Write a protein that binds this ligand. Structure first.
Ligand SMILES: C[C@@]1(C(F)(F)F)CN(C(=O)Nc2cnc(-n3nccn3)c(Cl)c2)c2cnc3cc(Cl)nn3c21
Ligand SMILES: [Ca+2]
Ligand SMILES: [Ca+2]
Ligand SMILES: [Ca+2]
Ligand SMILES: [Ca+2]
Ligand SMILES: [Ca+2]
Ligand SMILES: [Ca+2]
Ligand SMILES: [Ca+2]
Length: 373
């Protein structure tokens, strides 16, 4: 018969800003573009950048809690990894140098937890940068039947070769794999990666009792409290604050708008939307962000979103603003309180008047979970 999904859930993790290890760049683009693909296939997606051990374990555990009988679950990791005695590990951004298994999340344990579910399809995809000389070890096989599983594991030896092979947009190995191997053609309307130098590997392994695809329909409910819970739990972790018109005392109106780039990355943007006739010149800027978010002012207040480090290009956002990228939202302890400043001059005068308003926007996106240490 036709295979159906009970639900479609996905978790995508991209680690880049490593403290004790060389920084990567590729994950950002590949997480974003895979998120966009899966979203069009009717997955609810969580997409997280730059996670610590604690954050990664909470994220993966709560993903595994969503896997139940019939559920289609996809997990993706990109960033540094390591291998020891058949066991592979995903390295968080706070990991010490050298790597230790206590600090890292083990791949095989996640694989064993996923196959202990009666899911309709498990997909686990790893796009690891390895250390240069970290090849696969000599092992016995000591310790994949009824579970439907697709396991994909890509490696490049060294950050150089990793970033080289991942150069380009749209060209992710697993995005290509999913589009070619896991999508049935006419069921959906969806909107070269040359082999580069160095040492690389790809392994793909599958065990399926019947044909399964990411395009398989969700078994739809009209009156399920479980469907409601599932949808609402995800959706309330993805609320943006509404656009604000900030009216200053002198009559200047600044509009403040918001965009989601990841579940833990929000773009904010400002524009003047009314200047009164008394005032000849004005400008506005944002400052005073919570220290937990770690905002560098040099990546704030920029006149294109591209300059903040965003994926979002000048076509994707309202034009003619100053843009600021607020990453690390999972670290927010209290409320995202910040300050919008206005500088203005009265008609004909050299005198610049400064003014400011404090904005509270609550706990946007994944910050709503309030799950910090
Ligand atoms: C239910 C959630 C939610 F995000 F939608 F609410 C919960 N969850 C999390 O990732 N949760 C999470 C918890 N704590 C932390 N954290 N931040 C600081 C300290 N601990 C972080 Cl980063 C993440 C996942 C993961 N994958 C999926 C896929 C779908 Cl669908 N939902 N989903 C979820
Ligand atoms: Ca649809
Ligand atoms: Ca530990
Ligand atoms: Ca090894
Ligand atoms: Ca790429
Ligand atoms: Ca019915
Ligand atoms: Ca708190
Ligand atoms: Ca003055």
């Amino acid at each position: 018969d036709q295979p159906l999904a009970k639900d479609k859930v996905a978790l995508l993790i991209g680690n880049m800003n490593y403290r004790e290890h060389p920084k990567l760049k590729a994950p950002l683009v590949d997480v974003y573009e895979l998120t966009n693909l899966l979203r069009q296939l009717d997955f609810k997606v969580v997409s997280l950048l730059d996670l610590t051990e604690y954050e990664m374990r909470n994220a993966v555990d709560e993903f595994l809690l969503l896997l139940d009988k019939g559920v289609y679950g996809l997990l993706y990791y990109a960033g540094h990894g390591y291998e020891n005695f058949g066991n592979s590990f995903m390295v968080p951004v706070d990991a010490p140098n050298p790597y230790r298994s206590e600090n890292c999340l083990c791949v095989q344990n996640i694989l064993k937890l996923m196959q202990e579910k009666e899911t309709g399809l498990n997909v686990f995809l790893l796009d690891m940068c390895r250390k240069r000389n970290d090849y696969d070890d000599t092992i016995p096989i000591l310790d994949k039947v009824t579970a439907n599983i697709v396991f994909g594991y890509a490696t490049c030896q060294g950050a150089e070769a990793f970033e080289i092979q991942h150069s380009g947009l749209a060209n992710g190995i697993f995005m290509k794999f999913l589009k070619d191997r896991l999508l049935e053609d006419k069921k959906i309307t969806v909107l070269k990666c040359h082999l580069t130098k160095g040492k690389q590997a790809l392994e793909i392994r599958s065990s399926l009792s019947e044909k399964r695809a990411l395009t398989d329909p969700i078994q739809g409910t009209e009156y399920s409290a479980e469907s409601l819970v599932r949808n609402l739990q995800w959706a309330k972790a993805h609320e943006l604050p509404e656009s604000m018109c900030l009216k200053f005392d002198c009559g200047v109106q600044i509009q403040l708008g918001f965009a989601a780039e990841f579940s833990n990355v929000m773009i904010i943007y400002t524009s003047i939307v009314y200047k009164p006739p008394e005032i000849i010149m004005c400008d506005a800027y944002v400052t005073d962000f919570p220290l937990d978010l770690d905002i560098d002012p040099k990546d704030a207040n920029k006149g294109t979103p591209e300059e903040t480090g965003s994926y979002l290009v000048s076509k994707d956002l309202p034009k003619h603003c100053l843009y600021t990228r607020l990453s690390s939202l999972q670290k927010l302890k209290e409320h995202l309180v910040f300050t919008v400043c206005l500088s203005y001059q009265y008609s004909g005068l050299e005198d610049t008047v400064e003014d400011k308003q404090e904005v509270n926007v609550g706990k946007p996106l994944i910050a709503k979970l309030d799950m910090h240490r």
